[model samples]
Target chain A: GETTDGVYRVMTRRLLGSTQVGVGVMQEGVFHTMWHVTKGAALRSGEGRLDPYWGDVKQDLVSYCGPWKLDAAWDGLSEVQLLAVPPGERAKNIQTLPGIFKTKDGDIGAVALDYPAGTSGSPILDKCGRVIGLYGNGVVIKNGSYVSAITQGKRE
Target chain B: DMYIERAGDITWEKDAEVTGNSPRLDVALDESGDFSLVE
Candidate 1:
């Protein structure tokens, strides 16, 4: 699938918990987002919707992430892009920022770019728009920003 | 290029599971499944 085809803005409303928002990608009919977005709480659940930022489209989104059971792996460097709906932006405007795969530590990889707070769970896509990783955290440096990566798991 | 210590220290779990409504697609070729008919 192309980058836009699977990416969506995830909004999770946890029972007795605060609302969590981020980005997610649809894979094999299953929507994949960051575990932290759900806080590994069994009671946490959410729905994914197409970012109106991209365009008008209606798609049914189901599935909840059971964070504790998820694992990730790294496959090494490549040019990548991050698709995100930054804070304060209207639903009609999403951002596609360019960056390169930087480094990896254990299950996490780093990308060379600065992303804002609401960009978590944004999909790191290769040139073909294939999701290579999920953006989780950002590290600021004198040169630029390095966003931490979450392995998209095993994909065939 | 500066060294990044402990970057992306978010959730470190194993095999996250997704439970919800089934996809509308009849067949999924790979992890990057089809969404052309989603609308």
Candidate 2:
């Protein structure tokens, strides 16, 4: 329908979720974790050394780090990685407080994610490829259920 | 905690100029020269 030359059409995609966060805590044990779940859905349960809903804390929690995988597959989960604007400046979803996670040497850690094509129903995935979270249109993450653009996106 | 807007088309311009490709109609706002002024 038209013509073009000399210019490049590179789509600047914001990767919603593409990289796994390797979190290291000095505590080695987590007293608890808060899931910023989406409204109208059940919450996800945690695992290992604590309540499936919570974990115990480590006292000398000096410097903990993780090789933490994406834990579970997010059905339609993806991240917005700003390329032209560079990687480190893109915003990340925060779970609690002042928008910064505190560490011993002052601070550490970063946020990156990987998800699916924009048309899928659910939005969170377990690394094993099973969806484990649901996201509302506001992108609020809720756990334990399957609600897609068809089932959930249709109602009031 | 939420506000919402249903998807719909809202016109951005009435007497606008359009040019470009299929599926992507790149509209250009050019008020560089008004032919009515030539008179």
Candidate 3:
């Protein structure tokens, strides 16, 4: 895959006729995404694609960490951006929002943001453009939306 | 479309499980430039 400065579109199909689409990013030349995205993809497909808008690129799954471990690496940031590829769009989109370090449901270190549907694997980036967390579970509060955090994957 | 293949004999569900609290997931690269989970 040609290296670019944007998030990738991750697509996978399940055996039961369900499909999953999410966002991913590259770090240290390795592709990183959320565990649930990979897990849903792996259930029947055993493979998936990372599209950077240039073209479709394929890589191999190296490893991943569970949600519990992901929650322990919170950096205490109060704000962050969710970087993802909008559905049917091949370009990157950024959603800036306030971050809550913890959730009322006891998800410590989880970054809360206004996450939309089909954005489960988007990357939560800090001000410096560094990835701080992976986008996972979504929760609705009053009239706002938020997502649970996935630990930032390994970096250089 | 770019594709990511599952490594031989690796179960994604099992590989992602953590028995203890770890701050970060370890990653490494091989001579071929492929990244792997650092044990």
Candidate 4:
């Protein structure tokens, strides 16, 4: 039910160097990270959106110019070509996402979204290898605790 | 001297021991979770 060439992994890291969206699998031309990945960046302070450039498409804050709700079309980038361009040859017009769909290597800096847990974001690429989705910040949660939450690996 | 990118403001390569600087560029590990600039 899957092809190696068509399937890939997406890892989201935050910009301004703070949060991480973790990883997602790219399938059927759509890139999706489970809630586990999205939760890392979203749970920060305001429980807002993640950085579009560094996080998943669904948690992308830059998409709506601010934090947005997860509904239909959350965390999926349909119609993408995963082109890898050499760093020196990359064009200036393109904005790169952080960890996923990268053409060249770039630094993500110290990820501090979790304690006792390591974290990491985006770089979207065009069919022609042009960069896109290049795009930070914090609200600081204080004295909080939670227990009511759900976890799932995959849908049947 | 290396340049710091992704940080919100000017990030200059400095000794990790320095303090009070915005997005300190030092490479040593500490409470701030500051990362190495080498990429």
Candidate 5:
């Protein structure tokens, strides 16, 4: 079907700042487009051992790292109290993955852009063959065909 | 020019036109199927 928050996909929204994680999501923007969201790879990919034999508590999940677009501008201010500086803020100390859990929220970007499809090692390029995006997460080729996702409405 | 954040690395290939990591939806969708090549 469509997508909801918590899924992972290659979406095009307006994003601000330059880092790995968000210690603050204080930004303003508009909605752009919703590309492919994740299916099962919740919380840093669908890694970790299965706990069907035990239960939820037995499951060990790692923090996931990712971002979206905010079709607006930054407020230059925030209220979300940071327990520890976010990885985005102190990028030097934190590595990618084991993402930070951001309580702060940012805005969305408008005028969605088109995203191409590809797989591991095999990079997908623009029509002009110029490097635009890459292949790491999410699924595009389904049912023996490549299907693209279009943003329809907001999700909770 | 504007700066890209949290959205780090395009994870894009230009050809695919799509992103795989940041700047992604960072959410989930209702999809189906996977594969396995046994020996």
Candidate 6:
């Protein structure tokens, strides 16, 4: 494990054998990673290298710019999207978030209100397709898993 | 979410406010007004 000061791209996946999340943020061209917590300590100097859980998925990682603005972009009537399983499904069951059923005239219904925690990750998107927040519900973690909700937080 | 307190008993105050082809008694989230007043 080494340490450095740089901005890194981020990725998230579930921790094996447990209902928790893993995160990887690139630094120095490598995806330095962490285990079992959303927004956990990143791949900074002195932190471990890519997490033990990395590469469990066939999905690829991408490099993103650093020094990005972190904020909640909300336009309430718009839909949200995330890659997650519908609540009450298996953690392995993945689907694009926001199972919205909109009418031809643009009326919306059956929108996703939340997702199971420990089975999801960060970057909840707003109607404008802007990153809004993380996927998590503090209420369910006490039950040995996580759930997500629209947390009231700062906005951009 | 809100629900119709009752239906077919449209009040002028409410009927004048509705704006769809088929308005009826229903209750849910509304965004027409400033949420800050209630948020």
Model 6 chain A — which ten-residue stretch has the worst lDDT? A55-64
Per-residue CA lDDT of candidate 6, range A1-156, in tens?
A: 432322122323333332323222223333322123323233322333432223211111112223223345435444444433222332221223332222232322222334433333333445443444434322222233323333223212
lDDT by residue (B1-39, candidate 4, tens digit) is 111012111111122122111121223222332212222
Residues B1-39, candidate 3, lDDT per residue (tens digit)? 223322111011212212212122234433332333344
Between prediction 2 and prediction 3, the one with superior lDDT is: 3
Chain A (candidate 4) TM-score to true chain A: 0.21
lDDT of 5 by residue, A19-94 (tens): 2221111111211111222121221212322111111111111112222222222122311110112222221111
The model with the greatest lDDT is 3
Candidate 4: which docking quality band? incorrect
Predictions ranked by lDDT, top down? 3, 1, 6, 4, 5, 2
Per-residue accuracy of model 4 over A53-126 as CA lDDT, tens digit each: 22332222222123222222112332222121222222112221122211123222211121111111122333
What Cα-based lDDT does every candidate model obtain? 0.37, 0.18, 0.41, 0.23, 0.20, 0.28
lDDT of 2 by residue, B1-39 (tens): 111111111112222222211111111111321011011
Tell me the TM-score that candidate 1 gets on chain A alone: 0.53
Model 2 Cα lDDT, one tens digit per residue, A1-156:
111111111111223533211111111221111122111112111221122222112210111122111123223333211111112222122121111112222221112222222211122222332223222111111332211110111111
**What is the per-residue lDDT of model 3 for residues A1-156, given as tens digits with 9 covering 90 to 100?**
333333555554444443335656544344556544554332212332332212111222223222111212445643445454455544343444333333222333444444355566566555555556666543334334443534443332
> Model 6 misses residue A7 by how many Å?
15
Query: What DockQ values do the models have?
Result: 0.02, 0.01, 0.03, 0.03, 0.05, 0.02
Candidate fnat values, all: 0.00, 0.00, 0.00, 0.00, 0.01, 0.00
For model 1, residues A26-133, the per-residue Cα lDDT tens digits are 444344555444332222122232221111111111133222112333344433344544443432212233332232212234554454555566665554445656
**Please, what is the TM-score per model?**
0.45, 0.14, 0.49, 0.19, 0.17, 0.32
